[PDB]
Write a protein that holds these residues in place. Structure first.
Motif, mmCIF file in Angstrom:
data_model
loop_
_atom_site.group_PDB
_atom_site.id
_atom_site.type_symbol
_atom_site.label_atom_id
_atom_site.label_comp_id
_atom_site.label_asym_id
_atom_site.label_seq_id
_atom_site.Cartn_x
_atom_site.Cartn_y
_atom_site.Cartn_z
ATOM 1 N N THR A 28 -17.275 -2.802 -21.929
ATOM 2 C CA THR A 28 -18.117 -1.644 -22.131
ATOM 3 C C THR A 28 -18.598 -1.605 -23.575
ATOM 4 O O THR A 28 -19.676 -1.102 -23.869
ATOM 5 N N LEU A 29 -17.792 -2.148 -24.482
ATOM 6 C CA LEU A 29 -18.152 -2.152 -25.902
ATOM 7 C C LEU A 29 -19.245 -3.174 -26.092
ATOM 8 O O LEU A 29 -19.931 -3.189 -27.111
ATOM 9 N N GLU A 33 -22.908 -0.938 -25.955
ATOM 10 C CA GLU A 33 -22.556 -0.702 -27.368
ATOM 11 C C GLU A 33 -22.991 -1.781 -28.363
ATOM 12 O O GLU A 33 -22.514 -1.841 -29.502
ATOM 13 N N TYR A 34 -23.918 -2.619 -27.917
ATOM 14 C CA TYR A 34 -24.388 -3.803 -28.620
ATOM 15 C C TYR A 34 -24.825 -3.531 -30.076
ATOM 16 O O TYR A 34 -25.180 -4.456 -30.805
ATOM 17 N N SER A 35 -24.785 -2.261 -30.480
ATOM 18 C CA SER A 35 -25.319 -1.754 -31.745
ATOM 19 C C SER A 35 -24.686 -2.390 -32.977
ATOM 20 O O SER A 35 -25.024 -2.019 -34.106
ATOM 21 N N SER A 37 -21.054 -2.372 -33.917
ATOM 22 C CA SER A 37 -20.129 -1.446 -34.564
ATOM 23 C C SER A 37 -18.776 -2.107 -34.811
ATOM 24 O O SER A 37 -18.386 -3.021 -34.085
#
Lengths: 48, 405, 338
Positions: A28-29, A33-35, A37
């Motif tokens: 899920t990350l 969440e590909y941003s 982080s």
């Protein structure tokens, strides 16, 4: 995001049950969440 | 005997260009001092820099001590041991004045040899970012020279006090200034507007420089710029699955994204509190000229539509453009912008391009006016009409063929 | 501003041709009083009586200047907070100095203090569980807990309480201990003895863990920090005063270093999230520092106090030890799932 995005640590507890919802979080990350982080996925079983 | 200037007088016209921030100025300033055999100007420029700061009735409490004596840093840098870090020298406070001094010293260099000839006549004088500063008093009398450096000292100072970089990370690396390539000005603003929808009024990214057709520059807070960076990456990847389907309308875009070395947001609303303060900083000095208010807004807040301005002075049919900016910046940015419209551009303070300037025969570099190759009509003895091109001229036939099939 | 002195000559004693005025100590004070306070801040406590700092407001540009004065990049460091706890020292500085002399100093001490001989021993900031924030105003109180003399000289520990104006509560406690080297007293006696500790109720023990290898430059001139901090001491600026005090040169402010090594511990082990993490820091100055100095710092993870990691810092310029620092840091914030 509303409260600031700075470093977070995600820890799963219950020993051998720890890899599951972390692996759920891990994938899920990746996809939404590909941003790029800084995030830490930690497991009680594995990562002690 | 400078042919161009001699051309400039009777023949083809000329325009002066000044570069902006992000020019890697110090190494140019160091070389310019070493390459200078005449220190005459530097004597007064150093003294007036000391002077003008003292009478200042403007706030300027933080600025004056953090200002540095220009003569000392140079002589230090000439001993080869001393110099502060690039991070310190690139900061707007000490960088902005230093950039102008490099440009001003670049003006003097050409003015040394040929002044009677190398005197005034451009058609116009244009500038980029903080480069518009040095433009103004170059078109004014010689007593206004430091006023540039004086205003530049004020510009980078308030800009720094109002907004300065609070963080940076080796990846990308992430500045206040960002550039995207290959993408439309409309498409970039779209993704910009797509992202700005999700953020507060305090830190929006905006379009600062449009460098050309598909090349733009968007600027804002480094962190928020890094967020815009994310959406463009996702689209790049989703379109990758498209390209590998072997379809053109369904093909990936191949843009080029990568940040810049510039330390602070320019031409952004984040500098809005800086305009006021800067304005008062000029009126408390003998810097009073009515354009100090307009320059500040153009540099600090208002964007720069660049291509359209230097092109406008270009479409006036002025054949020559020089750039006294540090290293040389904006000299080459302008060239593919205009390209074959008849303009050609020599970097000033560049030894190769200056070799043109100083000779009778090496001067006339005039880039090809594509209309020169525009087709023409031809008649023949039996009276056939022939459309003339580089093809037809060789073959003696119509510029059309049936390819091998 | 001018400083005057006076001499007197009795040549009956040949070995003592010159004997100079006993009013020197009081004469030196009047000189410092004009320069330091300029009667600008005024409260009139005796050393025991509380020293009050009227009102203090933190502008966003005062945030930038300090964070810009001390910066770290090459090690992936990202400072984040509204007000770094280091910024506390700038607010409490002008008040603390006022306690350095007094009638209690007149009673038990000769009142002989060279200001050039002043030495900063330790500095620490203890939190009341509140952290400094944006525009809310501060008001500071400074008290001298004790006035001590040592084999090496006179020592004055100073306690400082920083309070939020609008809210009206005590946010933080600042601790300073200064050393004047010429004096003895019946007030508080110490030979080698002084001790301080950052302690917490619940503790866990760990093993030494190397975190970062730091490279920190000292500023070219000390005047920039002198303006912001409010420390006008000629030792760090004027070369004539630094040489008169018998110093290696215009010594870097120990206070700048304090924020220098801290800003790293702030960003490194603190990670991109320093603000709610470091709840305290202590700093010991081992040796003097000249401007244009390349200094190597090393922070390690030692043990745990109240759920906050303790971090020890050592400083070296070449072979010489410079700063000994230690900090209490909260861990990177954890989210649990069962």
């Amino acid at each position: 995001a509303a409260g600031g995005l700075g470093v977070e640590r995600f820890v799963e507890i219950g020993v051998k049950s720890a890899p599951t919802v972390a692996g759920l979080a891990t994938n899920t990350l990746k996809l939404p969440e590909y941003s790029h982080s800084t995030v830490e996925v930690l497991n009680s079983e594995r990562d002690a | 005997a400078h042919a161009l200037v001699d051309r400039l007088s009777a023949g083809e016209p000329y325009a002066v260009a000044f570069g902006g921030q992000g020019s890697a100025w110090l190494e140019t300033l160091e070389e310019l001092v070493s390459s200078a055999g005449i220190e005459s100007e530097l004597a007064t420029l150093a003294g007036e820099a000391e002077l003008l700061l003292e009478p200042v009735a403007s706030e300027l409490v933080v600025v004056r001590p953090i200002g540095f004596e220009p003569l000392q840093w140079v002589r230090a840098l000439a001993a080869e041991e001393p110099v502060p870090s690039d991070k310190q020298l690139t900061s707007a406070a000490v960088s902005v004045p230093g950039v102008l001094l490099t440009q001003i010293a670049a003006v003097r260099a050409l003015a040394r040899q040929g002044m009677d000839l190398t005197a005034t006549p451009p058609v116009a004088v244009a500038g980029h970012s903080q480069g518009v500063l040095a433009v103004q008093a170059l078109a004014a009398k010689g007593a206004k020279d430091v006023e540039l450096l004086a205003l530049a000292q004020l510009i980078g100072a308030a800009g720094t006090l109002v907004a300065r970089r609070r963080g940076i990370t080796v990846l990308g690396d992430r500045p206040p200034m960002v550039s995207v390539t290959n993408a439309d000005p409309e498409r970039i603003y779209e993704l910009l507007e797509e992202f700005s929808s999700d953020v507060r009024t305090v830190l929006p990214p905006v379009l600062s420089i449009r460098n050309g057709r598909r090349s733009v520059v968007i600027t804002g807070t480094p962190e928020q710029l890094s967020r815009f960076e994310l959406y463009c990456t996702q689209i790049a990847e989703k379109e990758e699955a498209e390209r590998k389907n072997k379809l053109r309308g369904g093909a990936v875009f191949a843009p080029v994204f990568d940040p810049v070395q510039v330390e602070v947001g320019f031409h952004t609303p984040r500098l809005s509190d800086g305009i006021e303060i800067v304005g008062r900083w000029a009126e408390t000095v003998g810097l009073d000229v009515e354009l100090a208010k307009e320059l500040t807004e153009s540099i600090l807040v208002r964007q720069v539509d660049w291509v359209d301005e230097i092109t406008e002075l270009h479409e006036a049919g002025a054949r020559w453009i020089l750039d006294l900016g540090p290293g040389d910046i904006l000299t080459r940015l302008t060239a593919p912008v205009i390209r074959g419209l008849g303009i050609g551009i020599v970097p000033a303070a560049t030894r190769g391009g200056q070799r043109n300037l100083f000779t009778v025969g090496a001067v006339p570099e005039v880039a090809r006016p594509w209309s020169s190759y525009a087709p023409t009509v031809v008649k023949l003895p039996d009276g056939s009409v022939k459309l003339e091109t580089k093809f037809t001229r060789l073959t003696g036939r119509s510029p059309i063929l049936l390819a091998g099939m | 501003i001018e400083i005057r002195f006076t001499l007197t000559d009795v040549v009956r004693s040949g070995g003592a041709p010159i004997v100079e005025v006993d009013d020197a100590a009081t004469a030196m004070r009047a000189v410092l009083a004009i320069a330091a306070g300029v009667e600008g801040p005024e409260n009139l406590p005796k050393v025991v009586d509380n020293t009050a700092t009227v009102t203090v407001d933190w502008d966003p540009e005062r945030v930038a200047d300090h964070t810009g004065v001390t910066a770290t990049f090459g090690a992936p460091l990202a400072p984040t907070l509204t007000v770094v706890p280091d910024a506390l020292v700038g607010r409490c500085w002008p008040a603390v100095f006022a306690a350095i002399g007094s009638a209690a100093t007149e009673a038990g001490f000769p009142v002989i203090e060279g200001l050039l001989s002043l030495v900063h021993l330790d500095h620490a900031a203890r939190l009341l569980a509140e952290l400094p924030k944006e525009p809310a105003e501060f008001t500071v109180t400074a008290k001298a807990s004790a006035a001590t003399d040592t084999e090496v000289g006179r020592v004055v520990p100073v306690s400082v309480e920083v309070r939020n104006a609008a809210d009206g509560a005590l946010l933080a406690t600042l601790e300073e201990r200064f050393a004047i080297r010429x004096x003895x007293x019946x007030x508080x006696x110490x030979x080698x003895x002084x001790x301080x500790x950052x302690x917490x109720x619940x503790x866990x023990x760990x093993x030494x863990x190397x975190x970062x290898x730091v490279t920190v430059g000292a500023p070219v001139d000390m005047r920039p920090f002198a303006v912001v901090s409010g420390d006008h001491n000629p030792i760090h600026t004027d070369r004539a005063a630094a040489l008169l005090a018998g110093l290696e040169g215009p010594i870097v402010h120990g206070m700048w270093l304090s924020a220098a090594a801290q800003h790293v511990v702030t960003a490194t082990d603190g990670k991109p999230v320093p603000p709610a993490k470091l709840i305290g820091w202590t700093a010991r100055f081992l040796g003097m520092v000249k401007p244009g100095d390349q200094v190597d710092f090393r922070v390690d993870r030692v043990g745990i106090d109240v759920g906050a990691e303790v971090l020890e810092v050592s400083a070296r310029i070449g072979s010489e030890l410079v700063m000994a620092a230690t900090a209490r840091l909260a861990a990177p914030k954890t989210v649990y799932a069962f």
